Structures are given as structure tokens and as C-alpha cells.
Amino acid sequence: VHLTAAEKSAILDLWGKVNVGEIGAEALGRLLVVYPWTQRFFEKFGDLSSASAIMSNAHVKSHGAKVLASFSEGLKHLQDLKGTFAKLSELHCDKLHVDPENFRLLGNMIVIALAHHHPSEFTPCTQAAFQKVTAGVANALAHKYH
Amino acid sequence: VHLTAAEKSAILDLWGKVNVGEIGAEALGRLLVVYPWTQRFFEKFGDLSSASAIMSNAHVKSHGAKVLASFSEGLKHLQDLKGTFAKLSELHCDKLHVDPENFRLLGNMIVIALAHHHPSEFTPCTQAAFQKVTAGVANALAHKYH
Amino acid sequence: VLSAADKNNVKTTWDKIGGHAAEYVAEGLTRMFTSFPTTKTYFHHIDVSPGSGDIKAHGKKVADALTTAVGHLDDLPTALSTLSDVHAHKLRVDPVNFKFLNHCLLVTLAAHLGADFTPSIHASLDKFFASVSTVLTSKYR
Amino acid sequence: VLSAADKNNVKTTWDKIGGHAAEYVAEGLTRMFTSFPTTKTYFHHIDVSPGSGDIKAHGKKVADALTTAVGHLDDLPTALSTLSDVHAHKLRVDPVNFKFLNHCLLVTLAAHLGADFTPSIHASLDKFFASVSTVLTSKYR
Numbered sequence: 001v002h003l004t005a006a007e008k009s010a011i012l013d014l015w016g017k018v019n020v021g022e023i024g025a026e027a028l029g030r031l032l033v034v035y036p037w038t039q040r041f042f043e044k045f046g047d048l049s050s051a052s053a054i055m056s057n058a059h060v061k062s063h064g065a066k067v068l069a070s071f072s073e074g075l076k077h078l079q080d081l082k083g084t085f086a087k088l089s090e091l092h093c094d095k096l097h098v099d100p101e102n103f104r105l106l107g108n109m110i111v112i113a114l115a116h117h118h119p120s121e122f123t124p125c126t127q128a129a130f131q132k133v134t135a136g137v138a139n140a141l142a143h144k145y146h
Numbered sequence: 147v148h149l150t151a152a153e154k155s156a157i158l159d160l161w162g163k164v165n166v167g168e169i170g171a172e173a174l175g176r177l178l179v180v181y182p183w184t185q186r187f188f189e190k191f192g193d194l195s196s197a198s199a200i201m202s203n204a205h206v207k208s209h210g211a212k213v214l215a216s217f218s219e220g221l222k223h224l225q226d227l228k229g230t231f232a233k234l235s236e237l238h239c240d241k242l243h244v245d246p247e248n249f250r251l252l253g254n255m256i257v258i259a260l261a262h263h264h265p266s267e268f269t270p271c272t273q274a275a276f277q278k279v280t281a282g283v284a285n286a287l288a289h290k291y292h
Numbered sequence: 293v294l295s296a297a298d299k300n301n302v303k304t305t306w307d308k309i310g311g312h313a314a315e316y317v318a319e320g321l322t323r324m325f326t327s328f329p330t331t332k333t334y335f336h337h338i339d340v341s342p343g344s345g346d347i348k349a350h351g352k353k354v355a356d357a358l359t360t361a362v363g364h365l366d367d368l369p370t371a372l373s374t375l376s377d378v379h380a381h382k383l384r385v386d387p388v389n390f391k392f393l394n395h396c397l398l399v400t401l402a403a404h405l406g407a408d409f410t411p412s413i414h415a416s417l418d419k420f421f422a423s424v425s426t427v428l429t430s431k432y433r
Numbered sequence: 434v435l436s437a438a439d440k441n442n443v444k445t446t447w448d449k450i451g452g453h454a455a456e457y458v459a460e461g462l463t464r465m466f467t468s469f470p471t472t473k474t475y476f477h478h479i480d481v482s483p484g485s486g487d488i489k490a491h492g493k494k495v496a497d498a499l500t501t502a503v504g505h506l507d508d509l510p511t512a513l514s515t516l517s518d519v520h521a522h523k524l525r526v527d528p529v530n531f532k533f534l535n536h537c538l539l540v541t542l543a544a545h546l547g548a549d550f551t552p553s554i555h556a557s558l559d560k561f562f563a564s565v566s567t568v569l570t571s572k573y574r
């Protein structure tokens with residue numbers, strides 16, 4: 001994906017205000033609650049059979065934070081997302097066989113977590129910029145499929 | 147997408163037996179009947195308000211044949227689908243704004259037309275090879291989105 | 293398929309939103325037009341500038357239709373039949389556009405409801421909007 | 434949402450298929466395992482070689498469940514409740530796998546039915562398989 005300087009600024013201005021681990025814990029938690037088949041990939045974490053269990057699980061919190069730190073690193077490499085995410089693409093595609101639609105769903109959960117915690121800053125224009133970058137990260141993660 | 151020599155042979159062996167215009171007319175006809183929102187792109191063709199009308203429409207037949215000749219040309223360029231389909235990607239993405247899921251649906255209609263007319267040849271292994279090439283063509287047509 | 297718990301989550305949340313529904317749906321439409329500009333093609337006939345009177349008016353129509361759906365959770369196809377005619381037969385709307393709108397509605401609710409937009413409420417609402425979309429894109433009568 | 438014409442297309446075609454249903458579903462499973470090899474992960478416990486007795490047996494189970502659905506087109510959620518428990522709660526099957534199977538079932542029917550697999554019959558069957566998938570991937574009871 002190509003992002004304009006305006007879009008990149010809308011993204012990075014908000015990102016400087018974001019608690020990356022808290023966004024990550026919420027986004028991954030919401031993924032598992034809203035799209036329950038995604039739990040199949042994370043059985044080792046413990047009981048994921050209720051929203052209550054998912055949202056209190058320590059591994060969901062720590063893994064969510066790890067995912068969002070990885071996303072943050074991506075934001076430093078907006079002109080080379082495919083290269084940045086190549087090793088993770090090999091992992092998620094060749095080893096884990098995650099269907100790429102699920103990458104887009106997790107991106108949408110990050111968007112929802114941002115709206116929840118930063119409503120005044122998460123304007124329609126700023127959302128639009130984030131939709132482009134979450135789509136870009138999903139496309140990069142899916143590259144080994146193509 | 148990467149295709150093995152075995153897969154390419156399964157594809158091209160069957161293709162030598164195929165009536166390209168007839169497959170094309172059937173595949174596009176089935177797209178319009180099965181997924182009716184796709185009719186929005188082809189209003190100029192005439193009445194598309196019934197299966198009967200869609201399957202008798204001369205423009206659906208001629209356009210279907212044109213689509214399948216384009217697909218045939220692609221089969222000559224399996225190591226460079228992105229380059230082969232670049233101009234058509236610009237058209238379908240930047241000018242027509244066709245959602246890429248629809249490229250995959252049309253690929254699946256070509257698969258169904260092949261099974262209909264070549265059941266003995268359309269074995270599970272030969273189908274598998276075709277699924278890879280229709281996915282590849284869809285990905286190439288969608289490239290301007292990424 | 294919505295569970296009875298999903299239906300209760302939808303009814304309770306919609307009721308809490310109450311008279312803000314039209315305003316929230318207008319915001320959802322503006323979010324859709326902004327994040328997914330290809331959706332604007334269906335609305336060439338109105339002013340789609342952010343904050344426009346035309347978007348406010350359309351947001352009211354859409355909110356009132358969602359109210360009809362919330363009141364008929366056991367039989368959405370009967371309740372939304374005329375709207376399916378509009379969206380499937382007349383306008384031929386590609387289903388991806390509904391995915392775009394539904395996501396933008398959830399983003400709007402997350403922004404306004406905060407902590408009250410729980411993961412469980414979010415899941416029930418996602419199922420509800422998806423069910424409405426399936427009906428509006430079906431040709432059944 | 435299926436129209437009454439869709440329901441008639443499904444009933445008539447299923448009846449014509451008759452006792453071939455199990456054989457056709459086994460072929461559909463083999464087409465799925467071959468074209469979409471990631472689906473094999475769910476079937477690690479059986480022999481999934483083409484023509485295997487295990488695939489024949491599973492094809493019979495799936496065909497008989499599709500027969501239950503064809504007999505309950507006005508209320509699939511009630512009729513398929515136990516199977517939703519299996520596929521959504523117990524096995525957590527990603528919905529993409531249903532897209533793969535449904536397509537492979539339609540390819541199988543196109544191969545065996547030829548001209549009798551009309552575009553109209555194809556459309557009704559696509560809607561029917563999609564409706565079944567929506568139920569089997571829902572958590573409602």
C-alpha cells in the first residue's frame with residue numbers, strides 16, 4: 001500500500017499517544033471473543049471458552065502486546081512492509097496456515113481498540129489512514145501465499 | 147503463485163481440449179446468476195433480471211469469450227502474471243473499482259464450467275492445479291489495490 | 293444465528309443508545325465514505341460532505357430500519373423484505389459495502405460507549421449487523 | 434435467505450441425486466483435501482487417501498446431515514443445533530474451510546449432473562450450502 005505524508009502523520013501523531021500493550025491486549029482479546037474460531041491457534045494459553053476467561057488470560061495480554069510491538073516496528077518501515085514482515089509471513093503462512101482474512105480481522109480489532117481509548121483523536125480521516133496501514137500489514141503477512 | 151511443472155501440465159493438457167468461448171460464456175453467465183450484484187458492472191448489456199435473460203444475452207456471451215481469451219493469454223505467462231495483467235489491473239481497480247473477491251468468484255465459475263464440460267478430465271488433482279492458477283490470476287488483477 | 297444472549301445484548305445496547313441512534317448512524321456513514329471511498333458511488337445523488345443535512349437525513353432512515361430489525365430478531369427476513377428489494381433487486385449493492393458499513397458502525401459505537409462497549413456486546417452487535425446484511429443482500433421475495 | 438423457488442430447486446435436485454449423495458459427498462471431500470490441503474489438519478485421525486474407506490464413511494455422515502437440512506429448510510438452526518456444537522464449540526473450524534467444501538461440492542455436482550446442473554439450480558444450491566455453513570459456525574445454543 002502507498003501512504004501519503006498526510007496519512008502517515010495522522011497515524012504517527014496518534015501512535016505517540018497510544019499504550020501499545022493495552023491496545024494489543026484488547027485487540028487480541030476482542031479477536032478471540034468476536035471470531036471464536038481464532039482460538040484454535042492459541043489452545044496452549046488456557047481456558048478461552050468465555051469472554052470472561054479470554055479477557056483475564058495473562059498469555060492473551062502478553063501475546064497481544066507482542067503483536068502490537070511488531071505492528072509498531074512496521075510503522076517504522078512503511079515503504080517496505082513486505083520485507084519487514086517476510087519472516088513473520090513465512091511463520092504465519094507456511095508453519096501456522098493462518099487464513100489471511102484473519103490478519104484483516106485483527107487489524108480491524110486494533111482499529112476498534114483505538115476508537116475505544118482515543119475517541120476525540122480517532123476522527124474519520126485518522127481512521128481512514130489506519131485502515132490503509134492495517135490492510136497493508138495484512139497484505140504483507142499474506143505475501144507468502146501469493 | 148508458483149506452479150510446478152506437474153501442475154502446469156495438468157492445466158495445459160486440459161486447456162488444449164477446451165472451447166474457450168463456450169467456457170467463457172458459461173462462466174460469466176453463472177457469475178451474473180449466482181452473484182447478482184455483479185450485474186451492476188454490466189447494465190449496458192440489456193435485461194439481466196432473470197437467469198433466462200442472462201444466459202441468452204449476446205453481450206454476456208461475447209464478453210465471456212473475451213475474458214476467457216485473456217485468461218488463455220495468461221496461461222502463456224505463468225511466471226509473470228502480475229506483469230501480464232498490469233493494464234487490466236489498472237482498469238478493474240482504478241477505473242471500475244471491482245472488489246477483488248469478485249475476481250476469485252469468476253475464477254470459481256471457470257472451474258465449475260470446466261467440471262461441467264470435461265468431467266472425466268477434471269480429476270481432483272487437475273482441479274487443484276486450476277484452483278492455483280485462478281487464484282493467481284485474481285491476485286494479479288488485484289495488484290493495483292496493494 | 294443469534295443466541296438469546298446475543299438478542300438481549302442487542303436490545304439492551306440499542307435501548308441505551310436510544311435517541312442518539314440517528315446521530316451515530318450518520319457518523320458511521322461519514323466514516324464509511326471516508327475510510328472506504330468506493331462506497332460513495334451509491335450516493336452520487338446527495339451531498340456527502342462531513343456533517344451534511346443529506347447524511348443526517350439518511351442516517352435517520354438507516355437508524356429507523358435498524359430499530360425495525362431490533363424489534364424483529366426472530367424473523368428478520370419478513371421485517372426487512374421491502375429493504376431487501378431496495379438493496380438487492382434495485383440497487384445491486386456489492387456485499388463488501390455492508391462489511392465496510394458494519395465495521396464503521398462498530399467503530400462509532402466503540403468511540404461513544406467506551407467501556408460499555410464490552411467484548412461480549414461487540415460480538416453480539418457484529419452478529420446482528422451481519423444478519424441484517426445477509427437479509428438485505430438476499431433475493432427471496 | 435432462500436426463496437421458495439430456491440427451496441424447491443434444492444429439494445428437487447437432492448431427490449434426483451438420491452442414493453448417490455454419499456458417493457458424491459466423498460468425492461467432494463477428496464476434492465477439498467486435494468485442492469485445499471490445509472483442510473487436512475481437521476482430519477489427522479483418519480486415512481484421507483483418495484478412495485479410502487474412512488472418506489466413504491465420513492461422506493455418508495455429511496450427506497445424511499445435508500439430508501436433515503434439506504428436510505428442515507424453514508428452520509436450519511433447530512435442526513442442526515447439535516452439529517453447530519460440534520463444528521463451532523468443539524472443533525473451532527475456521528469458516529474459510531466451509532467455503533472450500535461448498536465449492537468442491539458444487540464442482541462435484543457439476544461433473545455428475547451436467548446440463549441438469551443449471552445456472553438457476555447452481556445458484557439455489559450455493560445459497561443452501563452457505564446457509565448450512567452459517568449455522569454450523571454459529572454459537573447459539
Ligand code: HEM
Nearest residue numbers: 038041042066067070071088092096098102103106107137
Ligand atoms: C497484525 C497481524 C499479526 C501480527 C503483526 C502478528 C505478529 C506475531 C508475532 C510477532 C508473533 C511471535 C513470533 C515469534 O514467536 O517469533 C506471532 C506468533 C503467532 N501468531 Fe501472529 N500476528 C498477527 C496475526 C495473527 C493471527 C490473525 C493469528 C491467528 C488467528 C496469529 C497466530 C499466531 C500464533 C498461533 C503464533 C505463535 C504463538 C505461540 O504459540 O507462541 N497471528 N504473531
Ligand code: HEM
Nearest residue numbers: 184187188212213216217234238242244248249252253283
Ligand atoms: C478472470 C478475471 C477477469 C478477467 C481475466 C477479465 C478480463 C477483462 C477484459 C479482457 C476486459 C476488456 C478490456 C478492454 O475492453 O480493453 C474486461 C473488461 C471489463 N471487466 Fe473484466 N475481467 C475479469 C473479472 C471481472 C469481474 C469479476 C468484473 C465485475 C464483476 C469485471 C468487470 C468488467 C467490466 C465492467 C469491463 C468493461 C466492460 C464494458 O463495458 O465493455 N471483470 N475484463
Ligand code: HEM
Nearest residue numbers: 331334335353354357358375378379383385389390393424
Ligand atoms: C445496516 C445496513 C443498511 C440499512 C439498515 C439500510 C437501510 C436503508 C433504508 C431504510 C433506505 C431508504 C429506503 C427508502 O427510502 O425507501 C436505504 C436506501 C439506500 N441505501 Fe441502504 N441500508 C443499509 C446498507 C447500505 C449500504 C452498505 C449501502 C451502499 C454502500 C446502501 C445504499 C443505499 C442507497 C444507495 C439507498 C437509496 C438512496 C437514498 O435513499 O437516498 N445501503 N437504505
Ligand code: HEM
Nearest residue numbers: 472475476494495498499516519520524526530531534565
Ligand atoms: C456441509 C457442511 C458440513 C456438514 C453437513 C458436516 C457434517 C458433519 C457430521 C454429520 C459429522 C459427524 C458428527 C458426529 O459423528 O457426531 C461431522 C464431523 C466432523 N466434521 Fe463436519 N460437516 C461439514 C463441514 C465440515 C468442514 C468444512 C470441516 C473442516 C474442514 C469439518 C470437520 C469435521 C470434523 C474434523 C469432524 C469430526 C471428525 C469425525 O467425525 O471423524 N466439517 N461433520
